Design a protein around this ligand. Structure first.
Ligand SMILES: [Mg+2]
Ligand SMILES: [Zn+2]
Ligand SMILES: [Zn+2]
Ligand SMILES: [Zn+2]
Lengths: 87, 112, 559, 271, 171, 178, 97
């Protein structure tokens, strides 16, 4: 069996970033920041890596893409740029 | 209707002791007990007989007895459950691990 | 994570296949040559001999030897051994199925009883399940008797078409301890007079019929081609688990210290040597199996020591035996007590006390605990100044650190060392530091019955040896104060801190999905006081009013 | 036992509730797809009351002097009195409420008004009354064309399952049905202008907030429901410190999960 | 003889190099490990064909550390021998036991006891040589070799050669 | 630990490693049918000597172009040093295998021009012969059918001696001078 | 301290996947074993110096994989092997779905 991988259209999952999704992106980024990964947003003077990730998410300058999984094996690709942050 | 009778009875156990519980929780349990056609019991004889992962089933009483008859019937564990990755020490498809997080090189260039 | 770099690429285990050991693979995998039942000791001298445990197997005396592999215990996994058997031995857990297949397949020729020719078998073969299909079969083979040569086809019952051969009668088999007894029919009330025939089904005979079962006849029953041939339910070559499985304790040097399984294997081999010795010597025709059942005993008790047979196969002390099955049984038995629930590092247990001043989320960690508990922080251009000063402060003064990890897998014990006061911290290094204020921590009160009972808390390092928490969080935890103990867990990476501070935080767990209601309420003194305050009868004058207004930290400053 | 029987169960991204093999247990978790933490016991005002008082709170009749809205409530009220085109849209609102009257009585035979439902509507309007500081004397500017259409447009935004075809969109109707009944019960023409005193800015704020809070009240695909459901039943079972003299509590719950042929105390109720 | 084949490599990359041009470093570390590699299955990876448009694909981040795994699909110039292939090359070293003929990046040895009988090893020859009727075999001599056996090593593949058959020998 | 691609599922066994003689029996990786990264079935690309030189050279030349994009803000013996200069400006330096390859490849290149190489392939890949044979014929100096069908014994009965003799004559004609 | 079966369930309920793993790994067992590509058994010789691997019995030096699994799992798999049961470890999906 081949493909699989729903295109950038036909996507039918909640356009809102789930609390589970958001809780990892903020964690994965903050980890990278503390691991000496390049920071995109201008730091106002913050040193805490988790706080930088929260400023990175607010301006949507995070270069990450979530691969949401469906039970059949196929997936949808959503960028944090596309995703709406309510909560 | 048999499911509905079970739920109505389960409710009358908890609700009789001055405690309120939401529909979904009892409704899920009542479904898991009925979905498979008969009445899949919450027992060693019940649900633990189903087609569920071999390594997952073993984490309940029988342990070895399953592991013996799993190798005999040459059962392949899919490792899509909780216990499977828990034993293997990997991140299980659970909430935070229900997906993969990736980096886009093209988008990163835009942010500079 | 296991010391030293690996040139092999790392991946995740997606699938777990469950098969049975093939005797050819057991021989091929291992480098045992295991033959001597004697534990070790090079004729009283230290180190181990080329017999039992060691020959290219796991190391013991903090050495290297391990089939050139080296590494030395830590890092080195357990590679197996193979031991030869004089005669085949039944695997304890399969006795039921071995008997079940024997009643589903006739002896001598070794073929299926019912086929595509007979009905009821058709509806049995159609089911696409592994063991449900195997389960009858069964009853349609339990009738039954006689390996029939020819039966009627899918036409009129007159032209009986033939399939296989061997028109022998099938014995009815019962369970007898560790051996099988088969009772035959005939001889048509003329041969003999009355009684049937009783003989013991020998393992060699049993195995022989199993190795003659057809290719598709494996798959007709609940078995696979290259994974589980019914011939492997019977053991020809037994694998020997390496020292990491059955460790040598070694208290002192001139003493001993071997695990239960090592002695049982020595008893297996001791029994196996005798059966080999008798075979090519003056063997008393049928007094040999009065020692084969003793081999069918040790190999049986080595894997399981809790059967309806009865003898507990006790070690000479009154002690039963720690059989491999017992090592896997529910509660503190590898699966339930060592995999699904583990004893963990970076944790603390102490008595709780109520504090009406700490914030809802806050936890009152004692100074001593904060001194011992450690978080691994990375040296970053955002906190070099914050870390260098902390390292200099030492592991004795509160706001400090106890370890510095370099770029290489190297540990620096700051409490000892020689250059502990100096050190220029480098970009990328890891400094294991103390628990600072506002560090997210997982806080627990066992029994943990809720999504609560395990909440994320803000740390405020405080004097005195008790854990301190807000009174409003007592009902979700429960939790009293009559000598109640509580656990604490500390995260190790920035990623896990988010998982605590964004899903597990106390403020987030206020409203509960349990019953679409808040689970936390203001209880006791504060609940009793809030009533007495909010009465028509009660009033307050300036002196106390101004004080009460200042107690609110979010007061707008407008009286 | 409950926990170990439900471990794998979670709401997947298509809003179905599978286990580990892929077997569907609930097509929409909790038969609605709402997270329990965003729910309050609100009263369905459609069911309660007599047949007479129901008419005195929902029936809008432009074709009557005694049963129309007094032009002191709406600014465009006097020039609407008797319009045929607008009464058709008003009848389509009232005839819907009568359909809801029977629909809810076909579900809740007890006639219990209070039921657990997502999004508080009582407080979402209570704020609007004082956030804008609106007096209970001066009339509104909300046209009937604004009110009745704004509610119908809102129902098209309350998405639980993001659909594309017939089936999912047809199940979408079923998933929100009950919430819509509560929505129409509070945002009816008479209720909006007579009981409350909303202006256009207040009305469009209420709609925009009801819509937004509903999207928060949805289940986030990831919530391990099985474990959450098991602990929600097993925990209140622990605090259980103890004709009605029939197998009550604890061992009764045991018998349920055990599924035994003989009950300790049977008894069947006949009507 | 020479091959163009599609293959991939999985690279683990530290968070530190998540800079503006990681696309550069991914291709750089690819070349550092790939170009010059030698495997028993694929053989001598000589050069990476078609630089640019090397689809790196969207790589996933590791579960514990913020490192990333990239599956890199690329074309490359591949080469490996076979137990019956006939090639030609330049000789290098020479001994009492035979000479070592080099074909590209590969070194193929031919044994004296696998050559024509009428071929002697000269003792006082400088540089060392083999003599026949008029045929001369030294360093610069061009020889066509038949590959008999293939032996794989760490970062090298070697072959036992033969020139006993006709149409081989020297050019 | 490079590899990757075409990897099927070796469910245990596997089995009996096949000997790889001039019987066209090559390792599983090098069959007539193999996939591409586009995801389609394609004939195995068998390079002959001289053609391989152009393949590497073009890849090296078009490498230096993109290698300098970021850096902003003939006659046999003469080709030996020109490639040697090219190596120290694009290759990783320690690729001594490729340095040995290019020196060998440019020396025993039977053809020179992209014009001449093109016509050879058009003649060889029209006979419908199997890939490895096509590469061997356009890399070795062949004059006779017995010189050809005994060095590449896979041919034998696939083509008659007379037909192959013409091809070798049309190869010797198109054989570019040094 | 004890992070028991009850304690695990709460983290599943929270959904904290990385943390549940981090309790079971870096703060507990955490062990690096090597598997063969063909047989899913940790039987390969790991000379982590001269790179020599081998799975003599299946015979190959190329197809090898590194895994991070608990030490109690290593024991579990080995103890089951002593009872003749092979718990094969594969790093790729076969039965699809
Ligand atoms: Mg107490
Ligand atoms: Zn070793
Ligand atoms: Zn027979
Ligand atoms: Zn293997």
């Amino acid at each position: 069996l081949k493909e699989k991988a729903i295109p950038k259209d036909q996507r039918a999952t909640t356009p809102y970033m789930t609390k589970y999704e958001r809780a990892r992106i903020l964690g994965t980024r903050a980890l990278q920041i503390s691991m000496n990964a390049p920071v995109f947003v201008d730091l106002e003077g913050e040193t805490d890596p988790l706080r930088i990730a929260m400023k990175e998410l607010a301006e949507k300058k995070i270069p990450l893409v979530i691969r949401r999984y469906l039970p059949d094996g196929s997936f949808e690709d959503w960028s944090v740029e596309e995703l709406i942050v309510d909560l | 209707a048999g499911r509905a009778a079970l739920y109505k009875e389960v409710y009358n156990v908890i609700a009789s002791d001055g405690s309120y519980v939401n529909y979904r929780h009892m409704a899920l349990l009542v479904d898991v007990m009925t979905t498979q056609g008969g009445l899949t019991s919450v027992t060693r004889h019940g649900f633990n007989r189903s087609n569920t992962g071999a390594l997952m089933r073993c984490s309940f009483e029988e342990t070895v007895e399953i592991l013996f008859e799993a190798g005999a019937s040459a059962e392949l564990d899919d490792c899509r459950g909780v216990s499977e990755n828990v034993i293997l020490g990997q991140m299980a498809p659970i909430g935070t691990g229900a997906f993969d997080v990736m980096i886009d090189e093209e988008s990163l260039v835009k942010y500079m | 994570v296991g010391q030293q770099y690996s040139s092999a690429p790392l991946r995740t285990v997606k699938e777990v296949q469950f098969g049975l050991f093939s005797p050819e693979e057991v021989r091929a995998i291992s480098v045992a040559k295991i033959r001597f039942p004697e534990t070790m000791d090079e004729t009283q001298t230290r180190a181990k001999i080329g017999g039992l445990n060691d020959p290219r197997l796991g190391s013991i005396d903090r050495n290297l030897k391990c089939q050139t592999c080296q590494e030395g215990m830590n890092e080195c996994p357990g590679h197996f051994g193979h031991i030869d058997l004089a005669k085949p031995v039944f695997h304890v857990g399969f006795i039921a199925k071995i008997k079940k297949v024997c009643e589903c397949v006739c002896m001598h020729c070794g073929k299926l009883l019912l086929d595509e020719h007979n009905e009821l078998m058709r509806q049995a073969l159609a089911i696409k399940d592994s063991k449900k299909r195997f389960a009858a079969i069964w009853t349609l083979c339990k009738t039954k008797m006689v390996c029939e040569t020819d039966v009627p086809s899918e036409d009129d019952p007159t032209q009986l078409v033939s399939r296989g051969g061997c028109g022998n009668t099938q014995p009815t088999i019962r369970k007898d301890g560790l051996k099988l007894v088969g009772s035959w029919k005939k001889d048509r009330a003329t041969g003999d007079a009355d009684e049937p025939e009783l003989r013991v089904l020998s393992t060699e005979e049993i195995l022989n019929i199993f190795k003659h079962i057809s290719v598709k006849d494996f798959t007709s029953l609940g078995f696979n081609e290259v994974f589980s041939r019914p011939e492997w339910m019977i053991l020809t070559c037994l694998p020997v688990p390496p020292p990491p499985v059955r460790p040598s304790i070694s208290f002192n040097e001139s003493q001993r210290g071997e695990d239960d399984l090592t002695f049982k294997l020595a008893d297996i081999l001791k029994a196996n040597i005798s059966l080999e010795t008798l075979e090519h010597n003056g063997a008393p025709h049928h007094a040999i199996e009065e020692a084969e059942s003793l081999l069918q005993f040790h190999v049986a008790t080595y894997m399981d020591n809790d059967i309806a047979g009865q003898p507990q196969a006790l070690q000479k002390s009154g002690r039963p035996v720690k059989s491999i099955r017992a090592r896997l049984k529910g509660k503190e038995g590898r699966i339930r007590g060592n995999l699904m629930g583990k004893r963990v590092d970076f944790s603390a247990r102490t008595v709780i006390s109520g504090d009406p001043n700490l914030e809802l989320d806050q936890v009152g960690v004692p100074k001593s605990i904060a001194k011992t508990l450690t978080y691994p922080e990375v040296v970053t251009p955002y906190n070099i100044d914050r870390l260098t000063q902390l390292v200099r402060n030492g592991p004795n003064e509160h706001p400090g650190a106890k370890y510095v990890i370099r770029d290489s897998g190297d540990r620096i014990d700051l409490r000892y060392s020689k250059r502990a006061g100096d050190i220029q911290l480098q970009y990328g290094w890891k400094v294991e530091r103390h628990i600072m204020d506002n560090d997210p921590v997982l806080f627990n009160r066992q029994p943990s019955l809720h999504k609560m009972s395990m909440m994320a808390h803000r740390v405020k390092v405080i004097p005195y040896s008790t854990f301190r928490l807000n009174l409003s969080v007592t009902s979700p935890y429960n939790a009293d104060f009559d000598g109640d103990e509580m656990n604490l867990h500390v995260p190790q990476s920035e990623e896990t801190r988010a998982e605590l501070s964004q899903l597990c935080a106390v403020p987030l767990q206020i409203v509960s999905p349990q019953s679409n209601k808040p689970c936390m309420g203001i209880v006791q003194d504060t609940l009793c006081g809030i009533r007495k305050l909010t009465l028509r009868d009660t009033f307050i004058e300036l002196d106390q009013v101004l004080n009460m207004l200042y107690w609110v930290p979010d007061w707008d400053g407008v009286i | 036992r409950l926990v170990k029987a439900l471990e794998d169960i979670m709401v997947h991204y298509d809003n179905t509730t599978r286990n580990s093999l892929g077997n569907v247990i609930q097509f929409i978790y909790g038969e609605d797809g709402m997270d329990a933490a965003h729910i309050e016991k609100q009263s369905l005002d459609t069911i309660g009351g007599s047949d007479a008082a129901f008419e005195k709170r929902y029936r809008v009749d432009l074709l009557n002097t005694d049963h129309t809205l007094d032009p002191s409530l709406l600014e465009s009220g006097s020039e609407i009195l008797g319009d045929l085109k607008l009464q058709v849209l008003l009848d389509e609102e009232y005839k819907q409420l009568v359909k809801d009257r029977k629909f809810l009585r076909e579900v809740f035979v007890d006639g219990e008004a209070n039921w657990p439902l997502p999004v508080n509507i009582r407080r979402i309007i209570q704020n609007a009354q004082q956030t804008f500081h609106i007096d209970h004397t001066k009339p509104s500017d909300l046209t009937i064309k604004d009110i009745v259409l704004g509610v119908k447009d809102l129902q098209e935004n309350l998405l639980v399952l993001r659909g594309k075809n017939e089936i999912i969109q047809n199940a979408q109707r079923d998933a929100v049905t009950l919430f819509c009944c509560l929505l129409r019960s509070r945002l009816a023409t008479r209720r909006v202008l007579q009981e409350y005193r909303l202006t256009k800015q207040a009305f469009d704020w209420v709609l925009s907030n009801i819509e937004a809070q509903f999207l928060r009240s949805v289940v986030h695909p990831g919530e391990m429901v099985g474990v959450l459901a098991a602990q929600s039943i097993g925990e209140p079972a622990t605090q259980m410190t103890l004709s009605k003299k029939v197998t009550s509590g604890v061992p009764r719950l045991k018998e349920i999960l055990n599924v035994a042929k003989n009950m300790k105390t049977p008894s069947l109720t006949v009507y | 003889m020479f091959f163009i084949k599609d293959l991939s490599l999985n690279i683990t990359l530290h968070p530190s190099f998540f800079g503006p041009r990681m696309k550069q470093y991914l291709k750089t570390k690819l070349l550092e490990e790939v170009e010059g590699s030698c495997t028993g299955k694929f053989g001598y990876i000589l050069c990476v064909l078609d630089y640019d448009n090397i689809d790196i694909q969207r790589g996933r981040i590791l579960p514990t550390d913020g490192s990333a795994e990239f599956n890199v699909k690329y074309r490359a110039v591949v080469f490996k021998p076979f137990k019956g292939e006939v090639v030609d090359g330049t000789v290098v070293s020479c001994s009492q036991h035979g000479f070592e003929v080099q074909v590209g990046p590969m070194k193929v040895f031919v044994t004296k006891h696998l050559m024509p009988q009428d071929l002697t090893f000269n003792a006082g020859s400088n540089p060392p040589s083999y003599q026949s009727s008029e045929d001369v075999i030294t360093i610069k001599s061009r020889i066509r070799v038949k590959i008999e056996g293939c032996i794989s090593q760490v970062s090298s593949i070697h072959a036992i050669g033969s020139i006993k058959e006709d149409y081989l020998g020297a050019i | 630990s490079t590899s990757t691609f075409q990897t099927r599922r070796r469910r245990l066994k596997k089995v009996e490693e096949e000997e790889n003689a001039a019987t066209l029996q090559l390792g599983q990786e090098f069959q007539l049918k193999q996939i591409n990264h586009q995801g389609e079935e394609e004939e195995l690309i068998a390079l002959n000597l001289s053609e391989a030189r152009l393949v590497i050279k073009e890849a090296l030349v078009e490498r230096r172009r993109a290698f300098k994009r970021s850096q902003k803000k003939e006659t046999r013996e003469k080709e030996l040093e020109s490639i040697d200069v090219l190596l120290e400006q694009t290759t990783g330096g320690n690729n001594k295998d490729l340095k040995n390859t290019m020196q060998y490849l440019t020396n025993f290149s039977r053809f020179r021009d992209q014009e001449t190489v093109g016509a050879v392939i058009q003649l060889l890949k029209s006979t419908g012969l199997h890939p490895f044979e096509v590469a061997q014929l356009g890399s070795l100096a062949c004059d006779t059918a017995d010189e050809a069908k005994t060095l590449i014994p896979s041919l034998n009965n696939k083509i008659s001696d007379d037909e192959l003799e013409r091809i070798l004559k049309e190869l010797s004609n198109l054989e570019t001078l040094y | 301290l004890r992070f028991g079966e009850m304690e695990r369930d709460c983290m599943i309920a929270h959904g904290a996947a990385s943390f549940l793993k981090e309790r079971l790994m870096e703060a507990s067992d955490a062990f690096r074993v090597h598997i063969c590509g063909i047989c899913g058994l940790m039987t390969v010789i790991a000379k982590l110096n001269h790179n020599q691997f081998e799975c003599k019995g299946c015979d190959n030096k190329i197809d090898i994989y590194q895994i991070h699994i608990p030490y109690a799992a290593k024991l579990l798999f080995q103890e089951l092997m002593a009872m003749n049961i092979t718990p094969r470890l594969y790093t790729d999906r076969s039965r699809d779905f």
